[PDB]
Structure formats: structure tokens, C-alpha cells
Amino acid sequence: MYAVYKQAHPPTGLEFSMYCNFFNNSERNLVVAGTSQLYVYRLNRREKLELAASFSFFGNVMSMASVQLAGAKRDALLLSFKDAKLSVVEYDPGTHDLKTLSLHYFEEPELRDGFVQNVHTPRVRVDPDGRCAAMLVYGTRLVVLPFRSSFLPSYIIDVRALDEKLLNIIDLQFLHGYYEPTLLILFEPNQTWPGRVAVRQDTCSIVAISLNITQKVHPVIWSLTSLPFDCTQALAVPKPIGGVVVFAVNSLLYLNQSVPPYGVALNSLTTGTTAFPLRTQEGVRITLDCAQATFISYDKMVISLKGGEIYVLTLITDGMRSVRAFHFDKAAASVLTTSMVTMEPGYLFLGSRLGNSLLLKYTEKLATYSFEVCDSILNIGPCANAAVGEPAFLSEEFQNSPEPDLEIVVCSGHGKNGALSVLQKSIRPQVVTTFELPGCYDMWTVIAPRRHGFLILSREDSTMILQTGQEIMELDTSGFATQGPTVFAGNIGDNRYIVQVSPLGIRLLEGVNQLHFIPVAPIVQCAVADPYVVIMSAEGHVTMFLLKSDHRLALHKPPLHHQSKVITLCLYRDLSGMFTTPTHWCLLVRENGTMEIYQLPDWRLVFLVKNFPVGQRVLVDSPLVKEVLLVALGSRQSRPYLLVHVDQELLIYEAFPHDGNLKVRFKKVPHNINFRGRVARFRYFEDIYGYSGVFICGPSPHWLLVTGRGALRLHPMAIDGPVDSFAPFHNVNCPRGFLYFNRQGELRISVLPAYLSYDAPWPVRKIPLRCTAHYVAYHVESKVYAVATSTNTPCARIPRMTGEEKEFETIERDERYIHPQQEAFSIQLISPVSWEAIPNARIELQEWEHVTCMKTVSLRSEETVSGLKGYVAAGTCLMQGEEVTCRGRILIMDVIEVVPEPGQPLTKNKFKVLYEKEQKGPVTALCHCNGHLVSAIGQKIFLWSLRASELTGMAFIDTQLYIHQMISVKNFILAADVMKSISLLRYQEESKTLSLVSRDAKPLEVYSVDFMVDNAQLGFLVSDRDRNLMVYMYLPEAKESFGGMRLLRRADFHVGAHVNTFWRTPCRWENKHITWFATLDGGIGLLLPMQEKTYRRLLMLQNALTTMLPHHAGLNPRAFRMLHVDNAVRNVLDGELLNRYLYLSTMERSELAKKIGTTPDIILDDLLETDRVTAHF
């Protein structure tokens, strides 16, 4: 009943993209957007896109456009949301978030025109000259937004109240030229269907309505009424030529008001379907049906077809700025795009949901172009089926951890970009050498003559040194003072001189030989970085050293005015810095509660925050801080991050430029982490496996990474418990790697595992298949994966049923003809040892056959010590059109170890198919129930028993239309229909009887089903076609159901994305399982069941968080998570809104708890237990 939705992975897969003045009028920015998330990209120079801002929304972006208002310094964005919401937002300086300029709620009962089910999506379009902006609401209304307080009040134009009776609309653009903002509109007054073209040949029309802003009237000019029947999008040709090109599935037109309609055909499928006068384009046979296109300057057009192929159309222009003909050429292929944008002249971004959206570079060939691929953007595509599996190379030091160690494998992408994605949370290190060193609590690694030479361990009474190299060995001679503890030890200069500090004295060093000694309230910590040393005692005294060649450290006692005592320090330099007014900076935190940044050669106050230890979101110039660290991260050490440690709670800041002080401010960034002599916790590392960043030590270790993407990455590390200390380590027997202490006092020489990629929000290995991944199934015995794949071949035959046999008909057409796609399926076998496909192990299916399901079926057997064996079973059936009776085949597979072929270690595993027999009808789903194969053939659900060689039927029921999903636990079969509902079953074992317990009486189109598991409550989690989640329970004693026949929904929640996969894992809460799922728009989510008493303390929080916080784009987090309207029994909490309780400062954190009647000490114990129990994968 009572649950919480939490989001473990943000969604990947960009739908929208443009190129506007987001930050300022000087440079431009790639602004991409996806399912409920907005990104802003810069462009560094090899070229690479750098992330500059990322924004999350409580609503799915349905359209996007950018138009630069009058007098504004930036380019506003026009975000369109679902059921007619427009939202004009801008970037904000000062505070770094989005400032929202306008909202426009247009959801009315009188605008839907009686139609309940909204099918059409809202579409924002803008003027080339920036005069107005239009939204097509519902397909029946146009909303005009006039521009020059910078707006004008809108007015809704009824489309069907115009001339020519618009009806079906296709695409609408604004045209060029045209002193009034002319809006072109494609429409269909009499809609028809491809397949019914003999009574309706072609009905597509164009009206260029000319909009008077002032008079608020609009006359129709320039009508055309006989365009071909299937027209997709229209493109406004730019200013020197003008007009419009109208793509069709089989043709291509150019239309203008004075020029006659020039249009060519592309393939010979406009023979009897199009009576519009069309020419023949020479030597080209393609189709424009899902094609994205943009204009390069003018008279050039890059077209990304389906299949990913890029063409360049040049509009061959005569002297009179008319169009004579078209010219095509086949340039290089690329991703299956969902967007298309020209950036700076020479670049193209290709935003794709499915496949890695990448950036191109084009130069002319010696007007013919060639395309180069710059750095792509990683993308987990439409996650179709995903299976939980175990990794292969976990080290032997970590073998006896009680929690399971496992990872998920995701069928991402589609088609040519079809792939597998090996996703994995917290980093599992490779331990290559371990020690057992008690007593020593700190550690350091310095470079001696760029491998690390010395390992400097600080005990409570003495100091250990280690000599490294070929064979690491403990050092005995002079150099470091080993008579006491050392509080810091680090390189000064440029990896030439070593400096350690003891609480009495401060030693330089050149290696094994001491240079000299400087004596000094014991020293508690030091900041030895960038040829400047600053040493701080326990009473709050600060003194500075400095290398001076003649090299020698020189005391410069800083001029400082201590009205309150300094608690902690940091030092920082700008390789590629924004700190303007390389330059060195001292950061200093006094005990009164303030932060002070100091320019280091002088000591003048440059930056000052008056109330620092609270945790405010954005800082501006003029408790018990533990540790503060400023570090640069990214390309050429560009962007700095501030990291503090205040009352068991880690808060990190960004830095962004904002106009005799520093021209910067610090923006707070969210977390998932709690912190629940002096030892440092924020230990910066440079070049561990190429990755630079921060390791964060404590009860929950977290790797902080920023690569050349510019994106912040937090990766936990939960194996080997809490970690006390850490140091980078580069050796001979250990490569670029790292080095840490266990809590049980065990030093571990370690290397990151090299098969993953830590640049993504989870460490992921993207495995290209170059074919569509449909299903995946981890086989527990022998530890491999079984993937059903498909590839597109051109079709050539047509099956018939002539009463005695099948008779095939050869598709015999013209040589200028595109072929239908016939898909051939094949079952792979993937090895987790190295992720290559295992050779000589591929089951290839029949000529027309389609795998409809693959699961890891645990059938019982007479062989092993248990009953079960865990087979792989595939249900598969033939699609030969509607006039041929569809029959199926059940395919049971067993992966068997054999002797390997010499030179081929991966070939020790091979399929053995126990069962392959054609059934009586299509096989659509499969299951296991106490060792019984449960299959759904047609409108029956059989329950098989596998004997030594064959299946034997035991029981069935007559079920509904098309059961496509089935799951079960403990003889309760759940089912799922395409149109109707779920319908739970039950199987008495003693009599061979299968029975229907209950069913959802309402019609509901289900994607996939799961089992919400509580202590004794078993929920039935269901995702449907409207982007929702719902939990049905079988409650016989209730009276709002009928007696044991109707199911009752108990929790409602509007996830923003479709869901196909479902994983139940135990909990890292007596028997409460987490029902994980991976959303179809890229991300991964959770449902965690709770008790009622914990639930209603957080429902009171969420109602206060919804009202009292300025959400992005003026949205409502309550109405976005209401059921299906984007009869609601909501019981799932918005854990991505409850996660915004952590982001509030502790002054504002306590005001909400006093307004709802509790203390924030309870709510942090309420929230952070949901983060601890959900740290799987």
C-alpha cells in the first residue's frame, strides 16, 4: 500500500535540441532536452561538448523553441508540457538556476471539444524575426503569443472556424520574408489511410495564414489543395529564396506562391497513389517518412533518413531566385536521430533517443561534403528487457561479504545502434596486493625521482616510511623523522622537493636526504600545495612558507586580523580559472561562522560569506566546520568545486562567474551521501585510470569524478566497509591506481577495473551488437547471457493460404523500388568474462519467426540435489500477415559446458536445445511455477510438465485476448493483457487444476507487471500505456470489491516514462523487497514499501514541499504525479521531491519542520534510511 518512488538513474535519450543564446548574447549553446530534463552544452576545442547546466522538471517536455525577446540580454526558452502548458523560462545570473518568465495554463473542458482522449501533442513555433510565437493546442486551437513587461496577452484562434475546414493538421511553420508573421499550416481536410488509396487518392493542403497581431484578424493567403496523401513535416526555406519544402513518404515538393508547384518523386510507389504532377529524381531511391532535416546557411539541406543515412539536398537555384531542380548525394551514415541542429558553421548535432547522440563535423570535398564523427554522448536507449546478473572478476579479498554482488544488463538502443548495456553501481576495486598494518591511521604517497616513491604512514607514536619500485619494501635510513607522528607530507615545487610536517618541526627533503629543518599550540593540519605552504596550529594561528631559490622555505607570517579563531584552511590555484579580481588563493573559515577567500601574495579579503556553516544554496560576498577543500576539476582544471564537512553532512558547491572582489558565486549541488590527530576526508587525486577528482572518505566512500564532459559524477564504494584513508598510487607492479586503508587496518594496493566507463552516471560498458536486442536472460549455472537479436533484411516473398498448402509470391517490381523489411531472429550467447559473443553458439530461427519472450525458466528435474535446473526458454511464432493462421513453437534451451577448442577459451559453453516443437497457436508468454512451464498459447494458458524429453499438458484456463506478460510466485500466476487487464491465477497442485482468482474489471492497456512485496502484503505492480504505476491487491474481506472477484488499486503514481522491466531484490525492513524498474526513456527507478507511521510523517512533508518551494518552469509536483490525467488513490511518495528536503539549508530545513510539527533530526532519520537500504547494484 504505502510506498515511495525513488530514481536511481536519470533518463538518457534526447528528444529535442536547439542552438541559442542561453547564458549570454556573446556565445551560443547547444540546448538539448529529453524526457523531463534539460541540458545546456558548450563546445571546447579535438572538439568535445562540455556540460554547462542541467535542469530537471516535474513534467515531460513535449516541445521546445527559443525566441529572443525585445531588450533582453539572453534568449528565452519556450517549453511545452502535456495537456496544453506553455512555460517561458530564462537563465538567471546571480542565482544560477532557471528564472521562469511566464506560465500559460490552457487545459479547459471547452477547448478539448468533447474529446476526452488527448492524442495530439502541443507544438511551439516561433518567428524568424522574433515577432510572435504560436502553439497548436489539441490540434484544434492556435495560441498566439505576441511580443514587443515584455509579453502581450495571448488570444486563442479556433482552427476549424477558419476557411477550408482544417480538421487534421500535420505540421505548421512560420515562413520567411513576410512583414507580418505568416504561419504556414499543413493539414488534411479529408483524412485517409495508406492502404485505402483508391477512393481517396490525395488529400493534403496548405494554408499560409497571415496573422495581424494588432487587429487580431487573420486572412488566408496562398492555398494549395492537391498535395500527395502522405505528407510529413514542412520546412521553411530561408530568406534569400523563401518558400517551403514539404517532405512526403515517397516524394518531395517545393512550394511558393508565385512559382508553380515543383515536386519530384523518389521511388516508384507514386504510380497509382499520387496524381500530383511529379518528375523522376535521377539515380536516387529513398524514402522520407521519419526524416529530420535542417538548413545549412541557405540552399543546402542535410537530411537524416530512417536507417541513419545522411543526404545533402542542394536547391538548384536559377537567376530569378526560383527553383529548377533538386540534387542528392549519399554522404556518411550516422545515428537513428530524433533531432537535427546546425551549430557553428561546420558542425551538426544529432540528438537520438535510441543510440548515442553524437556531434558531426563537415567540410567540402575537393559542393560535396564529408562528415567526421566528434565525441558522442552516451545513451541507454529504450530499455526493453533487462536481466540481473553476477559479475565475473570480483577479487578474493571481497569474497565473504554478506550482501549479494550483482549487476544489471540492459537491452538498450534499437536497430543499427542496438546494443547491450552492462550497468553497475558502486565501484568494485581490483586488489592486487594487501597488507595488515595496525596502528597507522594516516597515509601519504609522494613522488620521488612520475611514479610514486615514498609511502608515508603516520602512527600515534612513530612514522613508517616505505620504499617502492619493483618490490615495495620498508625503509630504515634517515630522511623523514620517524620519532613521532607526521601531520602532512607532500611534494613542493614540481615533484622535486618533498615536504613533511611534524608537530614540532617542518622538514624539507629532496628524496632520501634531508635538506634542512624549520621549527615552529601543536600543528593540526597543513596545506602543502602550489609553491606556497600554510601551516595552522590548534589555537588558530596561521603561518605561511614559500620556496625561494638561491630552494629554501621562507617564513612569511600573514597579516591577519583574528576577531575569531580559524578552524580550517585550503589553498588553491587557477590553471584555467575564473577567479579574476595562475593565481593562488587561500580559503579560511573562522569560528564565528564565516568564510573568507584570500588572494595569496598579499592577504587582502576578497570574498566573504556572513553565515557560512548553515548550507545556503547560492553564496554572495559580504556549525562546527571540520574540513574544507577547493579543487579544480575537468578539462585543463577548469571548473572549481568547494567541498565542506559540517555536522556529519557533506555539502559541495560549484563555482560560476558573476560580476574589487571575486567575480564568482557558489551554487549548491544535490547529494545521496551522509556522513553518519586530524584525518583528512577530502583527498584529491589526479590521473587514476586517467580520471581526476576527489575521493571522499568516511562511513560511505564516494568517488567524485569530473571528466572532459564537465559533468559531476558521484560513485559510491560499499564493498570493504568504511574507508579511513586514501592516496593515489603509481608503481610498476601496480599501474595508475589507488591505495587505501580498510577499517580493520589492511592496506590495499588497488587498480580500478578497466572494462567499465566511469564517465556516465553509473559505470557502464556499452556493448554494440549492430542488431536489435530484444531479450536477455542470465543463466545462473555456468554464468552466461542469452540474447535474442534481430537484423533487417529486404523481403522478397508473400505467403498465402490456398487451402492445401502455403504458396509464396515473389515481390516482382520495378528496379526503382524500396523493399519491405523482413526481420530474421537469432539467439546469441554472451560471455561475462570478456563481453564478446561466444563463437559457434547461435540458434537461428525459421524464415519468418519472431521471439515473443525469453526468460530464465527454472523447471524441476530428477538429476540435481534440488529439483530445479534453470533452463532458458523462448516462445516464438511466425508473422506471415493476417490472412495466414499464426502458429508458434516453444524452444527450451540448456547451456552446457564442453571442452574448449584450442585457442578459444570462450567456447567452453554451447547451447543444447532439449525441446523444439511447433505448438497449436502462437506462444506469447512463458513462466515457471514450482517446476512447471506455464505458457500462454492464444486465448489459453497451458501449464506444462517437462519429462525426460517432452512437455505434458496438465491444466489450463480460457483467458482473454493477448496475454503478453506473465509472472508468478508460489503457485499464483499473474497475467497481463494487451487491452483488457491483469488477471491473477492460482494452481492447486494435488488436482491438476488451474483457476482464476480475481481480475481487474476495468479495461486497461498494460505494459508489464511485477510483485510489490511487503511482510505479508503482496501487491501487483502494473505499468500501463499512459505513463503510470498502480498496485492492485486481492482483498476478499473488503466490500468495495466483490467477494473474491475484483482487484482494487491501492497506490497510484504517474511516472513520467514507460516501464517494461521489473527486478525484485532483497533489502540491503524484515521482508520488504525493492521492486526495481528501468524506465523506457533511459532511467532506472525504485519502489520501496514502508510502514504507515513512517509514511504519514513524510506525506505531511511533501505537501509542504510542494507549495513552499519555487519549482522549475512553475510546475506542480502534485498534479504531475496524479494518475493518467497528464478516482486517484495516491499512496506513493515523490522521493525525488523528498530528496529536495536535503538540498534546503539547515535554517530553512528547520522552518518546514516547525510548520508541520516535528524536528528535522527525525526527518533526516526518516529520509536517509531510504537511501541506505537502497544501495544495491
Next chain:
Amino acid sequence: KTIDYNPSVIKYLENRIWQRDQRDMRAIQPDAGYYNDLVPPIGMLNNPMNAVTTKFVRTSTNKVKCPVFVVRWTPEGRRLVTGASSGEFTLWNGLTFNFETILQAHDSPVRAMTWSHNDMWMLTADHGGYVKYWQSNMNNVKMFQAHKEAIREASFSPTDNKFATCSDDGTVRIWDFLRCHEERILRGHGADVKCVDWHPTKGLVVSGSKDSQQPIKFWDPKTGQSLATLHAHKNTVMEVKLNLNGNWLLTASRDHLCKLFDIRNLKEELQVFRGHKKEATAVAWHPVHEGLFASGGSDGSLLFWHVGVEKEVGGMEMAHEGMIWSLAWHPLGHILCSGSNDHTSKFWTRNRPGDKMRDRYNL
């Protein structure tokens, strides 16, 4: 000879993953080789011109040759029961339409036939006045007598509790389901009533008539009082139907017209539906495409309509022989059946891609 819906649903579940919409859908091209790209009408949700079912399939005729009145699908789509004039239920197969079984339900011409909102029960009336319940295995369960004259149409509540029978004596009597108890009588109608549709949420009962003074009467099943009166047609409303959304009232009559009405606004009138050259005797709303419906004629004109277009989308003039009494779409909105005043019953499916529609029904 078969029309199998399985290779369209399997194609739909494979497109569902990487299609997010219909604007993303790879277009079917008008050719005889793109037969695998057909999706059911859940797939192409806009472009409802999909399910304008003008491809002939099969004439289901009996051996007894009796004129049929009601034809309804089993709610799993598995088989077609057919109500003829001899009281016989001839059960037609749902894919390969050959024959399954024949019953003899009533002693009269069967006039009404409804399935419940689950697959449990089936209400049937007849020309004598008897109302029987029927389980999904076509077993005869408790019968009674509802009217002393011929019942014409039944339909019922948004639950399985309470049905309404309209008859030729002029009363719409509201019944309890389990008790078989006549709860109340809705009198004051003017003449015999020939159709009743229950509202899918709000609990309304809308009745037709032959009377010109009180042609359409709204009702109230709890109070029993007539809520409002609609004066829509000149004569003899044959059918009255409602959507599944509950905003619209569709009404067919003998004045060659079909008319939409918003039940929230009765004083005005929505669009009218001409084109039936003879009387318009039957209406079947489409299940998944809200706003498009087939239409029968007394001469045999089978037409397809859509809410928003003034002319029809396109149908079959003079092509279905006889007078059409009732129509029933499959639970997937892809095939259609019609019940003739002839001794036959014909099945209509969607046109194939790329075919030349040159047969005796289209051109």
C-alpha cells in the same frame, strides 16, 4: 480463410518499445509487400481512418435461413453468438468463421442481447417478453418475464447490478440483477419505446420512442423521475447510443438522419449525419477510436462516420443486401459484423495496403 489479429499485435508490441508516438511511426506504404507493418487500432491511435472496414470477409449464413436481429461479440473476442428470428443462438468462430454450435434460447425472435462489464453474464430478451441470463459457456440460468409485450433493447449500469428493459408497451422497467426484482417503472413516454442506453458513469437512462411529442426522454434510475426531454427527430428513433466517455449522445432515426448531442447541453445541437438515402436503423460506436462509428441503413447502406467531418468518411451504398438490424465491432477495433434482415450476416475488415479496391462493394 482467416483474419488473424496476432501478427498485428506482435508487430505492435515490438514497435511499442522504440516508437513513442504516431509521429515517430514508420509509414506503411501502399504496396502489397508491406503486409507485416499492420498494427491494430491501438497502434495508430490518431488517423482513425484505419478502421474504416471496407474489405469483405465472409457471409455467415445458417441452414434454417432466419432473419437475424442481434449480433454481439463474446467479450474475449473468441466467438460470435447471433440472435435470429427463431430464437436460435448460432455461435460463429472468431478467426476462421466456419461454425461452432447452435442453440435454441427463446421461443420468440431475439430482440436484445448484451454482455456484462465482465465476462460473466449475458442478458437476452425476446419477442414474447422473457429475459434469461446466460453464463459464458452458454448455459441457461434463471429466467423470468419482464414485459407482457415485446422487449426491444436492454443495456445496463457501470456495474453488474441493475438492468433496464424497454418494450412495446411504452415502459422502461428497471430491474435488479440478483433478485430479478422490478425496481421501478418509467412511465410517461407517449408510445412504444425501442431503445435504451445506460450512461457509463453518471447513472442516466436515455430512451427512444415512436411518439413524436416525447421522442427522447432522459431518466433517473434512483428516483424514477424523467430528468429532461429532448426533441430531436421528426419520427421514430430507432437507436440511441452513448460513448464510453459519456459526453456524447448519438441518435439514429427514421428521418434519414443521425444526430450527436452533448448531454451537458441539450438546448443546442451538435452536427448531423446525412447520406443515408433510406432510414438509418443501427449504430455501433467504435471501441478504441473515440468519435468514429459505423451505421446501418434500411436499404443496406453501411456507412462509416467520424465526429468532426460533415460528409461521411466512406462506406457501402447498396452493397450489404437487405436491412441491417445490429452491428458489433470486435473488442479490437479491426473487424466488423452486420446483421441483415436477410437470412445472412457478413463480416467486414480493414483494407489491405496497396490493393486496388475494385470489387463489388467499393468500386
